Amino acid sequence: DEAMLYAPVEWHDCSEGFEDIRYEKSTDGIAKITINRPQVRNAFRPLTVKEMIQALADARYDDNIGVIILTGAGDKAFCSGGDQKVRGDYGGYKDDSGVHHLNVLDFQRQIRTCPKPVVAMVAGYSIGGGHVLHMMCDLTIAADNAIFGQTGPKVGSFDGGWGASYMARIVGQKKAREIWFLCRQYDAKQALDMGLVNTVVPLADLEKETVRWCREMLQNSPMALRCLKAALNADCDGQAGLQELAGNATMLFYMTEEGQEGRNAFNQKRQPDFSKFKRNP
Amino acid sequence: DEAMLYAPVEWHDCSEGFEDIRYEKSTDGIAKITINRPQVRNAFRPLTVKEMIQALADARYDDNIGVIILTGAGDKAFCSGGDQKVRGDYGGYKDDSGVHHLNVLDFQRQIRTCPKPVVAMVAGYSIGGGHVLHMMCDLTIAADNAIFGQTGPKVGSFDGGWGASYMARIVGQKKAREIWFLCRQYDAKQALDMGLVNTVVPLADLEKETVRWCREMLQNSPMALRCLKAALNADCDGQAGLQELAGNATMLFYMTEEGQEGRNAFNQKRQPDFSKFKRNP
Amino acid sequence: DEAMLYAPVEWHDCSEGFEDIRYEKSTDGIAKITINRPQVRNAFRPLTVKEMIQALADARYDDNIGVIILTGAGDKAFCSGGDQKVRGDYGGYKDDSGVHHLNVLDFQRQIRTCPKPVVAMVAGYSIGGGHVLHMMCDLTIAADNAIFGQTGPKVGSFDGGWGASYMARIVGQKKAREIWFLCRQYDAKQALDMGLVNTVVPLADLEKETVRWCREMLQNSPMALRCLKAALNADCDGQAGLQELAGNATMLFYMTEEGQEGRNAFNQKRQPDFSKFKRNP
Amino acid sequence: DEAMLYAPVEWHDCSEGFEDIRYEKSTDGIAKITINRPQVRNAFRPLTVKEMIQALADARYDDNIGVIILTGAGDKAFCSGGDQKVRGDYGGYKDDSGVHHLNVLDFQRQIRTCPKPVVAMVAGYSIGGGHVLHMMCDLTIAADNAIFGQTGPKVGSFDGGWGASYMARIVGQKKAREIWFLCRQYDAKQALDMGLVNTVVPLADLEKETVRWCREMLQNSPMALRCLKAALNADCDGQAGLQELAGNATMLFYMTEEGQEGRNAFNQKRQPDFSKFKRNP
Amino acid sequence: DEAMLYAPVEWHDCSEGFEDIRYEKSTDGIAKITINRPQVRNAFRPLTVKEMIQALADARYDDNIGVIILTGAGDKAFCSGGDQKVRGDYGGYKDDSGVHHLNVLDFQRQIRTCPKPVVAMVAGYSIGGGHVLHMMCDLTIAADNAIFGQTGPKVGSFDGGWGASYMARIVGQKKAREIWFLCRQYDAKQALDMGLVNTVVPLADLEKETVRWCREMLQNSPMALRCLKAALNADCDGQAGLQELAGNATMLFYMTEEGQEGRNAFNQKRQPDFSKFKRNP
Amino acid sequence: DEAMLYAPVEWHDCSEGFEDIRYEKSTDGIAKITINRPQVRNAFRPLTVKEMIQALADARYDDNIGVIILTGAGDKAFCSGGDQKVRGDYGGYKDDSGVHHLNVLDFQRQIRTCPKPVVAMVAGYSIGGGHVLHMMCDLTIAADNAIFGQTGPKVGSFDGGWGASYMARIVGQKKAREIWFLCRQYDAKQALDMGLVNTVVPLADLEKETVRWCREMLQNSPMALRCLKAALNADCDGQAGLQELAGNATMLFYMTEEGQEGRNAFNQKRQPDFSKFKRNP
Ligand SMILES: CC(C)(COP(=O)(O)OP(=O)(O)OC[C@H]1O[C@@H](n2cnc3c(N)ncnc32)[C@H](O)[C@@H]1OP(=O)(O)O)[C@@H](O)C(=O)NCCC(=O)NCCNC(=O)CCC(=O)c1ccccc1C(=O)O
Ligand SMILES: CC(C)(COP(=O)(O)OP(=O)(O)OC[C@H]1O[C@@H](n2cnc3c(N)ncnc32)[C@H](O)[C@@H]1OP(=O)(O)O)[C@@H](O)C(=O)NCCC(=O)NCCNC(=O)CCC(=O)c1ccccc1C(=O)O
Ligand SMILES: CC(C)(COP(=O)(O)OP(=O)(O)OC[C@H]1O[C@@H](n2cnc3c(N)ncnc32)[C@H](O)[C@@H]1OP(=O)(O)O)[C@@H](O)C(=O)NCCC(=O)NCCNC(=O)CCC(=O)c1ccccc1C(=O)O
Ligand SMILES: CC(C)(COP(=O)(O)OP(=O)(O)OC[C@H]1O[C@@H](n2cnc3c(N)ncnc32)[C@H](O)[C@@H]1OP(=O)(O)O)[C@@H](O)C(=O)NCCC(=O)NCCNC(=O)CCC(=O)c1ccccc1C(=O)O
Ligand SMILES: CC(C)(COP(=O)(O)OP(=O)(O)OC[C@H]1O[C@@H](n2cnc3c(N)ncnc32)[C@H](O)[C@@H]1OP(=O)(O)O)[C@@H](O)C(=O)NCCC(=O)NCCNC(=O)CCC(=O)c1ccccc1C(=O)O
Ligand SMILES: [Cl-]
Ligand SMILES: [Cl-]
Ligand SMILES: [Cl-]
Ligand SMILES: [Cl-]
Ligand SMILES: [Cl-]
Ligand SMILES: [Cl-]
Known part of the structure; x- marks a missing residue:
């Protein structure tokens, strides 16, 4: 366009x-x-x-x-x-x-x-x-x-x-x-x-x-862009690069129900129940 | 217990x-x-x-x-x-x-x-x-x-x-x-x-x-466990470790509405609209 | 040709x-x-x-x-x-x-x-x-x-x-x-x-x-090709790359008399004798 | 003490x-x-x-x-x-x-x-x-x-x-x-x-x-400490570690007569004369 | 020219x-x-x-x-x-x-x-x-x-x-x-x-x-040239590269008053006084 | 003993x-x-x-x-x-x-x-x-x-x-x-x-x-010892470590018939024939 x-x-x-x-x-x-x-x-x-x-x-x-x-x-x-x-x-x-x-x-x-x-x-x-x-x-x-x-x-x-x-x-x-x-x-x-x-x-x-x-x-996905930038830095920056790459993984995980269950259980003073989340291969 | x-x-x-x-x-x-x-x-x-x-x-x-x-x-x-x-x-x-x-x-x-x-x-x-x-x-x-x-x-x-x-x-x-x-x-x-x-x-x-x-x-999060295993491998295995770590980030991204909009858009033969997803700092 | x-x-x-x-x-x-x-x-x-x-x-x-x-x-x-x-x-x-x-x-x-x-x-x-x-x-x-x-x-x-x-x-x-x-x-x-x-x-x-x-x-040596492929991966894959490269070195070592003496001694219930094999610089 | x-x-x-x-x-x-x-x-x-x-x-x-x-x-x-x-x-x-x-x-x-x-x-x-x-x-x-x-x-x-x-x-x-x-x-x-x-x-x-x-x-040298901290990070942080370690080397170079001649020659719009600085082995 | x-x-x-x-x-x-x-x-x-x-x-x-x-x-x-x-x-x-x-x-x-x-x-x-x-x-x-x-x-x-x-x-x-x-x-x-x-x-x-x-x-600075060669090697040679790069930093540190105070204090059987050298950010 | x-x-x-x-x-x-x-x-x-x-x-x-x-x-x-x-x-x-x-x-x-x-x-x-x-x-x-x-x-x-x-x-x-x-x-x-x-x-x-x-x-294999020393360096020394490790692989390859055929064919001014050497998995 x-x-x-x-x-x-x-x-x-x-x-x-x-x-x-x-x-x-x-x-x-x-x-x-x-x-x-x-x-x-x-x-x-x-x-x-x-x-x-x-x-x-x-x-x-x-x-x-x-x-x-x-x-x-x-x-x-x-x-x-x-x-x-x-x-x-x-x-x-x-x-x-x-x-x-x-x-x-x-x-x-x-x-x-x-x-x-x-x-x-x-x-x-x-x-x-x-x-x-x-x-x-x-x-x-x-x-x-x-x-x-x-x-x-x-x-x-x-x-x-x-x-x-x-x-x-x-x-x-x-x-x-x-x-x-x-x-x-x-x-x-x-x-x-x-x-x-x-x-x-x-x-x-x-x-x-x-x-x-x-x-x-x-026009593209800001999340994909930041993940890719971190991944490309990661080929150069050792643990500093891992920090960026894993950091974005943490952000993503916080957006899932499995991650959120860990937080909810702590806030609700109960054990977490991760059994409802299927294990992928 | x-x-x-x-x-x-x-x-x-x-x-x-x-x-x-x-x-x-x-x-x-x-x-x-x-x-x-x-x-x-x-x-x-x-x-x-x-x-x-x-x-x-x-x-x-x-x-x-x-x-x-x-x-x-x-x-x-x-x-x-x-x-x-x-x-x-x-x-x-x-x-x-x-x-x-x-x-x-x-x-x-x-x-x-x-x-x-x-x-x-x-x-x-x-x-x-x-x-x-x-x-x-x-x-x-x-x-x-x-x-x-x-x-x-x-x-x-x-x-x-x-x-x-x-x-x-x-x-x-x-x-x-x-x-x-x-x-x-x-x-x-x-x-x-x-x-x-x-x-x-x-x-x-x-x-x-x-x-x-x-x-x-x-008792713990299977997602968290696999991410951490990959992250610890990644301190040793260079690009092979990045493959594992990033691969998990990819899995998590697929579980988000932002990632899903990209698939949906393609399948529906329309332009993706990522404007709806807030950019985090 | x-x-x-x-x-x-x-x-x-x-x-x-x-x-x-x-x-x-x-x-x-x-x-x-x-x-x-x-x-x-x-x-x-x-x-x-x-x-x-x-x-x-x-x-x-x-x-x-x-x-x-x-x-x-x-x-x-x-x-x-x-x-x-x-x-x-x-x-x-x-x-x-x-x-x-x-x-x-x-x-x-x-x-x-x-x-x-x-x-x-x-x-x-x-x-x-x-x-x-x-x-x-x-x-x-x-x-x-x-x-x-x-x-x-x-x-x-x-x-x-x-x-x-x-x-x-x-x-x-x-x-x-x-x-x-x-x-x-x-x-x-x-x-x-x-x-x-x-x-x-x-x-x-x-x-x-x-x-x-x-x-x-x-037309080329299959052994040399695989060692080289592993060596090129090793510039990228950290310890995973060393596994490949070292692994080929093990293969090669097994094909030598010095390597075989180790195995022969174990199978024959005797102490290995490596004295016959000159130390290269 | x-x-x-x-x-x-x-x-x-x-x-x-x-x-x-x-x-x-x-x-x-x-x-x-x-x-x-x-x-x-x-x-x-x-x-x-x-x-x-x-x-x-x-x-x-x-x-x-x-x-x-x-x-x-x-x-x-x-x-x-x-x-x-x-x-x-x-x-x-x-x-x-x-x-x-x-x-x-x-x-x-x-x-x-x-x-x-x-x-x-x-x-x-x-x-x-x-x-x-x-x-x-x-x-x-x-x-x-x-x-x-x-x-x-x-x-x-x-x-x-x-x-x-x-x-x-x-x-x-x-x-x-x-x-x-x-x-x-x-x-x-x-x-x-x-x-x-x-x-x-x-x-x-x-x-x-x-x-x-x-x-x-x-009690110790602040310059030595910062260089060592950078050097120790450098074993982990790839190019980001190199940025710190090399950055300190630059700082030190800027404190030498050789480095300063480079700067002076540029400000004075003349060719630098580095030949007066002995080459170490 | x-x-x-x-x-x-x-x-x-x-x-x-x-x-x-x-x-x-x-x-x-x-x-x-x-x-x-x-x-x-x-x-x-x-x-x-x-x-x-x-x-x-x-x-x-x-x-x-x-x-x-x-x-x-x-x-x-x-x-x-x-x-x-x-x-x-x-x-x-x-x-x-x-x-x-x-x-x-x-x-x-x-x-x-x-x-x-x-x-x-x-x-x-x-x-x-x-x-x-x-x-x-x-x-x-x-x-x-x-x-x-x-x-x-x-x-x-x-x-x-x-x-x-x-x-x-x-x-x-x-x-x-x-x-x-x-x-x-x-x-x-x-x-x-x-x-x-x-x-x-x-x-x-x-x-x-x-x-x-x-x-x-x-025509260029021999010191800058050796530091850069080491820095470029350092992107490839892991700790051996660090040895080179840091070794040049050591050379430069020896050329400074702060580094020399350390040597002087030792040879003069007195305690070093590093307090006269300002810390840079 | x-x-x-x-x-x-x-x-x-x-x-x-x-x-x-x-x-x-x-x-x-x-x-x-x-x-x-x-x-x-x-x-x-x-x-x-x-x-x-x-x-x-x-x-x-x-x-x-x-x-x-x-x-x-x-x-x-x-x-x-x-x-x-x-x-x-x-x-x-x-x-x-x-x-x-x-x-x-x-x-x-x-x-x-x-x-x-x-x-x-x-x-x-x-x-x-x-x-x-x-x-x-x-x-x-x-x-x-x-x-x-x-x-x-x-x-x-x-x-x-x-x-x-x-x-x-x-x-x-x-x-x-x-x-x-x-x-x-x-x-x-x-x-x-x-x-x-x-x-x-x-x-x-x-x-x-x-x-x-x-x-x-x-009492142990001098060859195994040197290969292992190289391999352990290689966890630290990037490409300098690869040089030692691969160098040892080359030495071993020279001791094999497949390696030697390459040399022999060149010296005898003929095409190498590697087909006699089975491809390991
Ligand atoms: C610390 C513990 C072990 C001490 O227990 P103790 O019995 O002595 O005290 P409590 O009665 O349990 O607690 C006292 C009050 O303080 C509240 N509280 C304690 N810790 C937290 C917390 N981390 N967040 C919110 N509140 C907390 C208690 O709730 C209580 O308040 P009241 O309800 O009575 O009013 C025990 O307290 C404990 O286990 N706390 C939780 C420790 C924990 O699980 N922290 C989270 C671990 N994860 C992270 O920190 C995220 C880090 C991360 O992975 C990351 C990675 C990359 C990028 C960013 C991050 C990031 O998220 O930052
Ligand atoms: C290839 C393109 C550019 C060719 O365009 P063209 O104009 O010739 O034909 P179209 O009309 O667009 O397509 C023809 C038919 O084929 C279907 N089709 C084409 N590609 C796909 C596809 N990848 N998936 C499903 N269908 C596809 C079209 O739909 C059409 O069929 P009909 O619907 O009309 O019946 C153009 O086709 C194109 O752009 N395709 C998509 C390219 C794409 O986006 N692929 C996905 C890219 N992402 C990945 O592959 C994931 C990789 C990844 O990141 C990853 C990372 C770690 C771990 C795993 C993965 C992983 O996901 O595997
Ligand atoms: C394990 C030991 C110390 C136990 O001693 P113990 O006194 O209790 O038992 P024995 O008196 O030896 O009697 C046990 C029976 O089992 C046989 N046996 C034991 N180990 C082996 C073995 N590894 N292979 C074949 N047979 C074995 C004994 O012979 C006896 O059977 P009988 O003859 O009486 O019927 C003691 O047993 C011992 O030291 N064993 C040898 C340990 C050893 O040397 N293992 C091999 C080391 N090398 C490798 O594993 C290869 C790994 C490698 O480096 C590699 C790298 C890259 C890619 C591939 C590889 C690879 O090769 O896989
Ligand atoms: C070893 C110490 C702790 C022992 O103390 P002790 O009380 O037993 O003996 P003293 O009475 O202190 O000394 C005995 C005599 O020997 C002299 N002496 C001892 N060490 C040195 C030395 N390293 N250099 C010159 N002289 C030394 C004493 O002076 C005394 O002689 P007299 O004059 O009274 O007759 C104690 O002796 C001690 O602390 N020594 C200094 C330890 C030290 O600071 N070494 C230098 C540390 N720096 C380096 O080695 C440089 C390495 C480096 O960083 C580098 C990096 C990259 C590239 C190159 C280098 C490089 O510089 O090579
Ligand atoms: C260079 C070529 C292509 C030029 O061909 P040209 O047609 O112009 O000349 P020719 O007629 O072929 O030959 C001229 C005379 O010179 C001899 N000759 C040429 N190269 C060599 C050589 N490398 N060794 C011995 N002799 C050589 C010819 O034989 C002829 O002499 P005459 O017999 O007629 O009197 C062509 O000559 C050519 O391809 N040569 C070989 C190129 C080659 O294959 N070199 C070896 C490659 N391997 C290595 O270098 C080992 C390096 C290694 O991998 C390593 C790794 C880790 C640790 C150590 C090492 C190491 O081995 O050092
Ligand atoms: Cl893609
Ligand atoms: Cl934690
Ligand atoms: Cl060659
Ligand atoms: Cl020291
Ligand atoms: Cl510049
Ligand atoms: Cl073993």
């Missing part, structure tokens, strides 16, 4: 109180987080990350939202990683109160455990920490002007966490070592060819196509 | 067709598989394993059975492992047709994936392949005359699968290397002290205590 | 007793399992699965068979997954007796642990559970009319087991999330491009090329 | 705005989170968990805190798990707004990823979700009146995430399956013997001994 | 004492190990491996070297694997003294744990054990005449270690099973298409391009 | 060329490496480690040696870890040439990958890096005066590799966190009780009992 998928999107502004990002919601259930620091190619300082964390937490708890888009303001950059202008000498990035942070690690975890799909909408540069962020998103929609790469070994940094291992799970070990060791830039076609992004579209149609992809997911 | 836990048990014989084992079921939902080759300390030959497999399959599919006991005939042996008298040169144990088998590997997987708890009831020797068998069982109830250990490096064999890795998940890596490398025998107290068995009871009380443990589990 | 590789194939029917599938063997060592429910696009019901499990067990134990082909009858579908017409409310698919099954999980594990290569021969739709089946097969040969995808989030289901994790080990995490979250369909070239199938051939050439691939494997 | 270790402790309150918990800080760097619903054996409702999350976030960000204690009010209970009185049918526990939560999962991950040691101080009952909470804590100090166990299969629930797998990494797979399948209660001595808690002390000495253990850690 | 990247390279010979290989170093920090047995398509015998290990150890310990190239003499072969003419019956390859070796396993490990990037420069055949060798190298630069493949199942062998699992992490599980099961040969384009090599260049420009890639890495 | 087990041991000196260690061999197949720096409680400097690696390589290749003992000179210390007197600021311990090493990491991997059992014979202190060394050994025989612990967080170091993860696989996650975070010392009984060492014997009986354990293993 292209008429539905390509219908106009009406964004409602929810940016009140944010300084470094914009946060918007569509009537049909898309939340969009936009890094708004185009002057530094949308690099994040600790405040930026803090605000993205708050926005993503809101999206998670808004039961009208089914999908999140992460993007950068303007056409030149999605995100250029940590703001090197505030990178201190004592183990992180300094906020205005002098505290050193590495809070993008919290945001990565939050994207990972979000039960709703998160989509990176990438125009122009997705570089360094900004590159890890697009990789963390479940899907990436790239404009034909998109440019991807890491710079760690050039700028005195590295992401040896999901920035390395998870990258290898997307593009394979040979490509991952190349990306990290040489710190070249890759155009959208190169990214597409290596399986790094899901599709490449003309810059002009970036939001149009991204919104179609979100709407396709919004 | 001790009166209920220690009530007499009435075994019904279901051994029709078996030559190397006995197979029985209680009215209150316990299936018991007994290796019946005491003349060889209950060593298994390929036929024996084939029968244990058939029995355990029957127990899986009988919706009145909730727990399975595995044990050996007599008081002298649980199982002394592969019957070395029929072990061929061509990579396995010879059946009367001359085919070389290692079908205990199938029995290990079957116990592993059985959605009902399997309890090893050990009197006397649990040795070699027979020792791996008790380990594979979810729980082990040991008589005070029980003796445990491996013999592989002494008799020209080894179990480098669950017989090694899973043993280490039970007794730790130092004890596991000790048990394998030296091939000593360990008595019941030594076994309990290392976490190898769940409890040790006087030989005369062996079945009485095992049935008590079985009955305590039979 | 194209003459040999493209020689005519001579199928012998072994379907007697099967209601939902065909089962055939070639003189040169190929067993072929064909889902035969074209009226439902080769959707499996619980009987279908039980028969496929019986057929694959037969092929495993037939020492003349070296390779298995799995395919769908006709040219419109390989398999469309679980039969939604018989999917019950109580956690699975109803058989004629009203028992609720998810027995395709058994069949997945059987393909996985089969020591002989299994080849999916896909014409037309490989969808849902039927898509996971082709993925489980070691290799996939696709016709130019082949169509691939999942539908779980559309039809209220999910495979978060090998259907998710193992999919990711084939096409990468970005593609896996796309496939599962959007539930689009993908044509043969799309599947080839993402590494989902091994090759794409004109529909007319489907069996001809599949049989060629089978015959190439049939 | 026992005089230092057993010095009186001086708690200052930081509970402003909390209804379900108390939150306090000692003058020497210990924070203490106390579940304060002793009338229901310190069962948590969604609000309770939310408050615990806020308190733990505070402790994490307070650089004068080096260690956190988790405990329950009164002598009778540490925590009895999820509050069954507010457990709803729709897959979680209802807050006053009707939303269904499983937010203890967030708290579990927050304890896990906390860079500071978290110590469970257990008096009386640690049961169900309350038992998983003490397990998640790095260390457990138990009073002689402490009682441990799970109840899931009895009350229609299960924790198949860290509550299962991680439990196995503490007590081993045999005890873990016993604990979950039978849902017995275990006294302090039983807990100590299976390795489930670190020490058992007289109830009268619980706080004094817990504070001693805390002070011992407070 | 292409002028710099494509500048002449000045090799100096360091082959003194080697019989099967050449070993050279450039003034700008590239070490090159060349298998020199072109008469047997650069197959390795145990001495060849021994020599390669010695050269790679020398490269690791030379603080002037930052990158290693592995290659074969001539342009017909990179390496055709183990030398079958000296392959013994007793489980390995015979040296002149009749000891049977599989020492390529040590060389694989040594490439894996080398803190400096290792680059396969492939002209002609990279086959069998020789194909596993290029896979182990972090990157592969292939000439347009390069040919890739395994032969194990044809020549009575298999690499079920990194040869299998790590191959799957490169090309995906479907392509890995194809490569191993059929033992076909793949041209440079096929290899590139499946992600098996990083780039393909004209044969006459093989070294020129390889040296360029090396110089690009040689 | 106890007469055999407790027979006198004749040590022959092989220490020529060593400065920091002694190296001796028994006539019945035991190699003993003794750290010889009692004046610093047998702390290792880079030369010490280099010597131990040389000694262990020699033991690996001496086909008369079946088991290695690692120990410390005198009765006061096994090993107190890294020599803090030569620990430099630049990420390692300085040799006489000023190079900074962490070469114990090499020795750890060498113990891990040694195909012969390695036994720690511990009298007195096993502390720090010295404690990790005893853990790495397959088994530990402790004297009643033995003391165990880590000191990292006190002395500005950590071993977050095998020092952490592998310790947890020995003593469990709760104890492992205790040991690392508090840096207490533990007597021999405490070590035994937590599963940290295999046995405790009177100091005067240390070598006598250690040699008995050694001789017990020396």
